[PDB]
Design a protein around this ligand. Structure first.
Ligand code: PZ3
Ligand code: CA
Ligand code: ZN
Lengths: 324, 308
């Protein structure tokens, strides 16, 4: 019942040239400065969306590679920015960027692997950093990082699988930790995890697929759990999860596409979380990635597992089999 | 309006500079707690600053008395609670509280459970708070039965129930911990959930939980007279509801599921009829509904082939 009403003057055409201008000029500002704590991921979002649009060249490779190297700490982990602390979230982001750039040896890969290895707990879970927060998001960061480096064998995979499956819920979904309620974000992370570790046969695809397709609201937009507002980034979380489990056809593609197009800003470029709100590069990546999954011809095919161009992943030979 | 924030940015920027300079200097002191409090209130997702607070608190406990360390802990609890009042949905703030409580000699868990009850009164769907509550319940070794009493009160006092039903799905198996629910428990849960969705037939949470309960038994070939009779009664009650709310998709889906739970082949004709109606009422789910129906027809073909 909680939904947004798309007003009839909302954008209904893909403004790609505008989006690429928006990202190309991003960080040339109040909000830029206040999100320094996620900079490495911000950089990943901008570069990935640019590459999906064929505009990667307009970004600054040389400058990003020096930034990334300065963000690797003596433990092997990578921080969001210089002087910030290392975390699995930013280690993943850094590794996705270097994968996009074919420059993995810009950082010490052996130390990244040792960092990831060090964060696994006896029950198979991963902490995000030395301070011990446990989340299935971090199980995904860990195996995704290692998959991209060809080093999945470095962790205890069966225990890691056991922990993730212990976060499966009555409704077929997954939460942060055992007993946590199902949420699209964690479902995305856990289905991604199970794709990487070849365990999708353990998902109840019909049950989870139904929970996911019930995320679509009359507006066409997807929410992240029951009784919440729709949002462009859930487009992505939910749609990617559906693709991994072979049930993408269970949502109304055309209604979702109209929702996503309605979140664009016709003047400034970029996408917001919902129509008419202020845009950012996070929702710009996920709007564009969502459209690509829906089969938008002007955007490169995107991996539902790694949220990177498929041609990048083909090139490193890391393409997990999905359900169907 | 868009001028003062240039000055608020100025304060954020220099405080942030200050904290990092002090940290490089090995100055793990109260001035960093001062600076970080001024940034984390507005910006609790700045993870590195939570790490600095922990580093300071760890350091200070080495060179302060039990009394002075006890005072720092209580000041940290108040700071944390003021942060949560401003932003109750920050991973960082909740983890810090967990970190803090996990290292105290004698933590007060009854108080932490009450903090949870209060935040859940504000927002019954706050999963950080539900997660914290499960953490506190475990640490205090609170019994499944008590948490079950907490959920009941929450479900009836108002809606926004998905989180409370989810918690029940996890608690119930613990009260009957096999290496599936016992029928007596299952029947009691069916009565509770069915009350919920006849009270508010638009609350999707009860319907999702009811679909789970429908699978959580022992199979249609094993139906007791009592379970058989309860399910038939649910079927007639949903048909009643369908008259009142012809646009209600959850009741139509549930009718199909009930007929399946009762007798797939005897109800084959009505099942097919209900699929047509439901697809007309919920067209965005047409593809799902066609796939579900194809699954059910295959099940039926196998049942017809099982014949002697
Ligand atoms: C506004 O205060 C904030 C609150 C939270 C965050 S956040 O950092 O926690 N993160 C990103 C996020 C970024 C911006 C933002 C602003 C400016 C810029 C500019 O750069 O970006 C804004 C919002 C926002 N939100 C909050 C939101 C959005 N819509 C509704 N809400 C409530 C989502 C959130 C969830 C999240 C958590 C972990 C994660 O990592 C992985 O899961 N990695 C594995 C993976 C690998 C590959 C692909 C996908 C995933 C990714 C996303 C940041 C700011
Ligand atoms: Ca360039
Ligand atoms: Zn969002």
């Amino acid at each position: 019942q909680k939904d947004v009403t798309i007003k009839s003057d909302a954008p209904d055409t893909l403004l790609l040239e505008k989006h690429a201008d928006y990202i190309a000029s991003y960080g040339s500002d109040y909000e830029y400065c206040m999100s320094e704590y996620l900079r490495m991921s911000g950089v990943y979002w901008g570069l990935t969306v640019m590459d999906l649009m064929g505009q990667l060249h307009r970004m600054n490779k040389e400058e990003i590679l020096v930034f990334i190297k300065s963000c690797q700490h003596e433990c092997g982990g990578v921080s969001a920015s210089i002087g910030h602390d290392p975390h699995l979230l930013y280690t993943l982001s850094a590794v996705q960027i270097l994968t996009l750039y074919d420059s993995i040896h810009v950082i010490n890969v052996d130390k990244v692997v040792a960092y990831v290895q060090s964060l696994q707990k006896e029950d198979g879970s991963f902490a995000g950093d030395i301070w011990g927060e446990i989340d299935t998001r971090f199980s995904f960061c860990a195996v995704a990082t290692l998959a991209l480096l060809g080093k999945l064998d470095a962790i205890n995979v069966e225990k890691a699988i056991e922990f993730v499956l212990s976060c499966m819920n009555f409704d077929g979904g997954f939460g942060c930790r055992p007993g946590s309620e199902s949420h699209a974000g964690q479902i995305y992370c856990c289905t991604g995890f199970l794709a990487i570790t070849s365990q999708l046969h353990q998902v109840n695809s019909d049950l989870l697929g139904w929970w996911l397709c019930e995320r679509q609201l009359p507006s066409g937009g997807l929410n992240g759990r029951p009784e919440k507002l729709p949002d462009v980034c859930y487009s992505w979380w939910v749609l990617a999860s559906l693709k991994i489990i072979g049930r993408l056809h269970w949502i109304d593609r055309e209604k979702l596409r109209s929702f996503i197009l309605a979140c664009q800003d016709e003047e400034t470029g970029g996408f917001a979380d919902r129509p008419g709100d202020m845009v950012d590069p996070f929702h710009t990546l996920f709007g564009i990635a969502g459209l690509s999954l829906l089969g938008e011809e002007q955007i490169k095919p995107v991996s539902p597992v790694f949220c990177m161009p498929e041609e990048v992943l083909q090139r490193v030979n890391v393409q997990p089999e999905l359900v169907s | 309006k868009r001028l003062e924030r240039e000055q608020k940015l100025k304060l954020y920027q220099s405080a942030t500079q200050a904290v990092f300079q002090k940290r490089q200097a090995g100055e793990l002191d109260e001035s960093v707690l001062e600076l970080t409090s001024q940034i984390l209130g507005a910006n609790p997702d700045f993870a590195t600053l939570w790490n600095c607070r922990r580093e300071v608190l760890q350091h200070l406990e080495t060179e302060k008395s039990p009394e002075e360390s006890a005072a720092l802990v209580k000041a940290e609890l108040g700071f944390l609670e003021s942060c949560l009042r401003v932003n109750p949905k920050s991973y960082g703030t909740w983890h810090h509280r967990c970190w803090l409580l996990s290292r105290l000699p004698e933590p007060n868990w009854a108080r932490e459970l009450e903090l949870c009850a209060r935040f859940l009164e504000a927002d019954e769907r706050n999963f950080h708070c539900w997660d914290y509550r499960r953490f506190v319940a475990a640490q205090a070794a609170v019994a499944p039965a008590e948490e079950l009493a907490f959920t009941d009160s929450l479900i009836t006092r108002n809606f926004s129930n998905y989180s409370s039903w989810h918690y029940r799905s996890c608690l119930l198996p613990q009260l009957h911990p096999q290496p599936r629910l016992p029928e007596n428990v299952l029947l009691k849960e069916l009565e509770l959930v069915q009350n919920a969705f006849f009270t508010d037939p638009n609350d999707q949470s009860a319907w999702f939980y009811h679909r789970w309960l429908l699978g959580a038994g022992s199979g249609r070939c094993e139906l007791s007279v009592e379970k058989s009779t309860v399910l038939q009664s649910e079927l007639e009650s949903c048909k009643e509801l369908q008259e009142l709310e012809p646009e209600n998709k959850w009741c139509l889906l549930t009718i199909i599921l009930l007929m399946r739970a009762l007798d797939p082949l005897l109800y084959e004709k009505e099942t097919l009829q209900y699929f047509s109606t439901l697809k007309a009422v919920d067209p965005m789910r047409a593809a799902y509904l066609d796939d579900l129906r194809s699954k059910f027809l295959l099940e039926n073909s196998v049942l017809k082939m099982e014949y002697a």
